[PDB]
Amino acid sequence: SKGKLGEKISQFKIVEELKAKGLYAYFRPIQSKQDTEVKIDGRRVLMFGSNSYLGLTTDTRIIKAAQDALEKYGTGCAGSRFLNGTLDIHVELEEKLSAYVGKEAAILFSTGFQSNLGPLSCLMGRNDYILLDERDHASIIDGSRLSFSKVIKYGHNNMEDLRAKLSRLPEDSAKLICTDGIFSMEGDIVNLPELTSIANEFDAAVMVDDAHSLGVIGHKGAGTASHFGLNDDVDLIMGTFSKSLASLGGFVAGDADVIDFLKHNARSVMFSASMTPASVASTLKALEIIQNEPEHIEKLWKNTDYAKAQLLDHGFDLGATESPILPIFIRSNEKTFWVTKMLQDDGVFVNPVVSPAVPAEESLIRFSLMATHTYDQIDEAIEKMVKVFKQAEV
Amino acid sequence: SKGKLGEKISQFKIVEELKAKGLYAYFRPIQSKQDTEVKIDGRRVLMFGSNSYLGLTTDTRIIKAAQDALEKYGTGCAGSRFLNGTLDIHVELEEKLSAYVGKEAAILFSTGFQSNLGPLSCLMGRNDYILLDERDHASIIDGSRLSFSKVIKYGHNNMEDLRAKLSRLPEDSAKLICTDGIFSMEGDIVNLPELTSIANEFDAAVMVDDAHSLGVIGHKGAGTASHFGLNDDVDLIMGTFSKSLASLGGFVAGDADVIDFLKHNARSVMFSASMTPASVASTLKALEIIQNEPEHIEKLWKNTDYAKAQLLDHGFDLGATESPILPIFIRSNEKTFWVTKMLQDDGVFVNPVVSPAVPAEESLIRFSLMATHTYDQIDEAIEKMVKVFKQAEV
Numbered sequence: 001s002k003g004k005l006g007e008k009i010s011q012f013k014i015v016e017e018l019k020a021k022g023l024y025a026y027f028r029p030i031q032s033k034q035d036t037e038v039k040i041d042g043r044r045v046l047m048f049g050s051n052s053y054l055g056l057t058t059d060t061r062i063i064k065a066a067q068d069a070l071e072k073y074g075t076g077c078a079g080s081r082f083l084n085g086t087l088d089i090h091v092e093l094e095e096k097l098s099a100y101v102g103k104e105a106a107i108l109f110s111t112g113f114q115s116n117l118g119p120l121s122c123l124m125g126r127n128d129y130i131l132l133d134e135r136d137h138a139s140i141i142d143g144s145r146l147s148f149s150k151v152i153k154y155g156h157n158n159m160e161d162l163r164a165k166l167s168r169l170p171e172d173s174a175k176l177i178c179t180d181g182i183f184s185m186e187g188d189i190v191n192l193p194e195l196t197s198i199a200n201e202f203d204a205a206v207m208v209d210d211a212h213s214l215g216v217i218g219h220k221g222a223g224t225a226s227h228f229g230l231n232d233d234v235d236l237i238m239g240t241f242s243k244s245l246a247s248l249g250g251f252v253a254g255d256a257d258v259i260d261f262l263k264h265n266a267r268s269v270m271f272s273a274s275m276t277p278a279s280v281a282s283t284l285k286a287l288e289i290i291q292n293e294p295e296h297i298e299k300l301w302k303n304t305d306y307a308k309a310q311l312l313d314h315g316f317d318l319g320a321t322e323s324p325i326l327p328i329f330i331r332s333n334e335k336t337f338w339v340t341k342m343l344q345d346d347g348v349f350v351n352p353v354v355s356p357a358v359p360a361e362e363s364l365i366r367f368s369l370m371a372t373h374t375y376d377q378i379d380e381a382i383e384k385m386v387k388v389f390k391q392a393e394v
Numbered sequence: 395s396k397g398k399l400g401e402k403i404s405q406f407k408i409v410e411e412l413k414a415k416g417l418y419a420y421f422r423p424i425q426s427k428q429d430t431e432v433k434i435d436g437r438r439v440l441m442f443g444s445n446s447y448l449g450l451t452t453d454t455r456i457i458k459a460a461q462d463a464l465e466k467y468g469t470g471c472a473g474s475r476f477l478n479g480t481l482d483i484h485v486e487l488e489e490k491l492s493a494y495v496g497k498e499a500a501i502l503f504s505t506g507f508q509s510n511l512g513p514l515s516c517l518m519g520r521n522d523y524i525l526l527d528e529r530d531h532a533s534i535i536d537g538s539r540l541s542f543s544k545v546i547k548y549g550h551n552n553m554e555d556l557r558a559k560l561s562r563l564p565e566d567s568a569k570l571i572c573t574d575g576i577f578s579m580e581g582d583i584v585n586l587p588e589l590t591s592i593a594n595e596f597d598a599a600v601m602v603d604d605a606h607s608l609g610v611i612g613h614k615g616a617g618t619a620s621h622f623g624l625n626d627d628v629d630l631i632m633g634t635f636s637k638s639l640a641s642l643g644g645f646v647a648g649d650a651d652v653i654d655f656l657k658h659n660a661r662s663v664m665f666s667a668s669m670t671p672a673s674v675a676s677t678l679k680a681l682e683i684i685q686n687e688p689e690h691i692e693k694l695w696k697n698t699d700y701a702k703a704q705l706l707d708h709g710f711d712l713g714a715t716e717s718p719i720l721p722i723f724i725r726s727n728e729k730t731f732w733v734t735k736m737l738q739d740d741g742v743f744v745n746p747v748v749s750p751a752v753p754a755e756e757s758l759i760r761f762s763l764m765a766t767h768t769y770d771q772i773d774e775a776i777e778k779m780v781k782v783f784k785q786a787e788v
């Protein structure tokens with residue numbers, strides 16, 4: 001029955017307003033492979049809003065690996081890993097990931113999102129605590145909420161606030177600190193040396209979400225612990241396959257005893273169907289390519305350094321990025337929607353960040369680099385961005 | 395740091411005990427396509443533990459559709475649907491699903507699990523209520539927990555307990571009833587006529603999870619509302635693609651206003667990467683096949699009716715199934731593990747249900763049919779099951 005349900009959704013009008021003004025640019029329907037240019041409505045659009053940092057979703061070797069896995073294994077495993085959903089190739093991928101991030105063991109999940117839900121929901125319980133950076137990804141907030149623990153947020157990269165909040169807590173309790181490695185909004189890196197120093201003082205577990213770090217920072221792209229040399233101070237390394245690894249799915253890597261507990265206690269792996277064979281194969285081949293072909297990471301950072309310098313030289317106001325995420329401040333929600341749509345209509349795809357995700361005065365567009373971008377494409381996007389920021393009067 | 399974390403996992407010894415006794419049969423590594431026979435450790439094993447009800451994960455047309463989508467679109471969309479992750483083929487699949495279940499609109503999620511999280515987390519809020527059948531799937535319990543509402547469980551298919559629990563609630567609040575259509579444990583069907591009758595009396599929204607119903611009950615497999623003719627009394631139809639549809643992903647279908655609210659407010663679609671092209675294409679082709687080839691559903695039910703009659707004639711104690719899930723009671727956790735492993739070692743794959751999921755005296759094996767099974771295979775499995783139940787002294 002719909003009476004109260006209709007009332008619950010009645011006040012949500014921002015989408016009707018964006019559509020009526022001709023500003024709507026969510027769920028833009030792409031007609032082609034994710035690449036430096038995509039086809040939208042039959043026309044070519046430069047893609048600066050992707051998470052495919054190494055451009056690997058179009059690698060013919062990766063497509064072929066996925067197609068060969070369909071031929072051998074079919075379209076799906078039709079069950080949880082726990083029951084009838086495990087393939088030899090899932091186990092192979094766990095072994096290869098464990099080696100890549102320097103841990104004993106790993107467990108796959110069918111999404112990155114579900115990779116966060118698993119350990120956050122089942123390790124800390126009643127009378128225990130989870131400490132979260134306030135900018136942590138939605139999946140981390142949701143995972144922690146599924147736990148029976150007390151969830152405490154600390155100020156963004158604020159080690160005094162983390163330390164104080166941990167100091168308040170009863171000694172006879174378990175504590176788990178979970179952080180993004182690279183934060184997607186501003187593209188900044190966690191203070192992992194200080195956070196792990198605090199964790200070691202209070203015997204808290206440390207979990208890092210490396211969604212935006214894998215294939216980006218660390219030796220051969222192995223992520224945030226690898227970047228800082230702090231593998232031995234991080235209990236759990238979470239990753240997704242949907243970004244540099246060009247696929248779908250995720251993982252959690254750690255000590256074999258903790259991983260064995262997770263694979264038999266995390267509801268998001270016990271009660272969800274396993275990754276498709278095509279996605280296991282594509283992830284395995286992308287992981288081989290990231291490690292054996294240092295070019296990709298190198299070219300990603302040449303593009304990042306080039307685009308960042310060009311944006312600062314044109315007078316754009318950038319956030320405190322340390323990654324291929326270039327946050328360009330606009331500081332008005334209306335201007336952010338307008339700039340986004342005008343760029344779309346001129347052949348440039350960027351992602352807006354607006355209220356209520358952020359305060360109006362912190363609204364921005366995120367311009368993300370891909371190893372496969374050219375300096376010519378970067379130049380064309382920035383040319384168009386200068387013109388639209390002028391038209392918009394930013 | 396690991397001191398307290400080590401203590402949190404210290405008491406979990408059932409897996410070490412199962413492995414040490416040689417009884418462990420979780421995460422069995424399959425070497426072949428999901429089919430009526432699978433390869434485990436180089437040997438052939440009859441599969442009676444699958445959710446591929448129509449045997450479609452090996453359909454050459456479905457494999458080819460997936461392989462052609464890899465060729466055109468690549469290995470992944472590398473973002474949320476909300477941003478850079480929408481393809482024309484995702485929209486096509488939503489339109490085809492909406493038509494199939496008789497609703498205005500639909501939104502895809504990358505997993506079934508995440509399809510439950512979406513509407514349960516964002517429609518009911520502070521001062522509202524979610525009413526759940528106590529046997530509802532883990533993803534429904536987890537979705538409801540992510541809401542800011544009060545979650546109330548009612549007795550399994552107990553309409554007096556649902557009615558009483560709703561009667562206690564303040565009139566000026568929203569209420570949402572969520573149920574499995576077919577329940578996976580016992581394979582029983584929700585009392586949807588009575589539940590919708592109650593919902594209509596209290597103006598509560600109705601959501602049905604049709605994970606085990608799609609491709610199984612309803613006209614051309616359209617699910618539980620379709621089975622009862624109650625499309626107009628169900629607000630939201632949830633489905634997965636991982637079972638009859640032989641893929642990965644899921645959906646929620648409903649009124650265009652509710653679906654528009656979900657696609658801009660459900661964290662599990664806004665903040666998770668979209669389905670892979672291969673999985674969209676495989677789902678589209680499976681959905682065409684289920685509707686255009688009535689054979690598949692027909693043969694599933696011939697196998698179900700045959701196997702159920704054969705089990706009852708051999709004196710097995712079955713649960714109150716109304717589906718291709720045949721629950722065979724064992725009523726001892728030890729016997730359930732032993733029967734499971736002995737069947738594995740004799741070439742038969744079944745799924746155990748044990749404590750703490752159920753009371754010891756309700757422990758069972760689930761024997762699930764596939765349209766592609768033969769009567770010869772059914773006969774061979776039941777022959778082996780009689781022998782193992784004798785060896786085990788059930």
Ligand SMILES: Cc1ncc(COP(=O)(O)O)c(CNCC(=O)O)c1O
Binds near residue numbers: 506507603606
């Ligand atoms: C009733 C029900 N609802 C939702 C889901 C989630 O769908 P996905 O597996 O596609 O994420 C399942 C999964 N069934 C697998 C299990 O519980 O083992 C299910 O049985």
Ligand SMILES: Cc1ncc(COP(=O)(O)O)c(CNCC(=O)O)c1O
Binds near residue numbers: 209
């Ligand atoms: C930091 C972080 N962690 C986890 C995930 C979840 O991974 P999957 O998308 O593979 O489920 C994302 C997703 N980023 C997409 C977004 O927020 O739009 C992420 O940005």
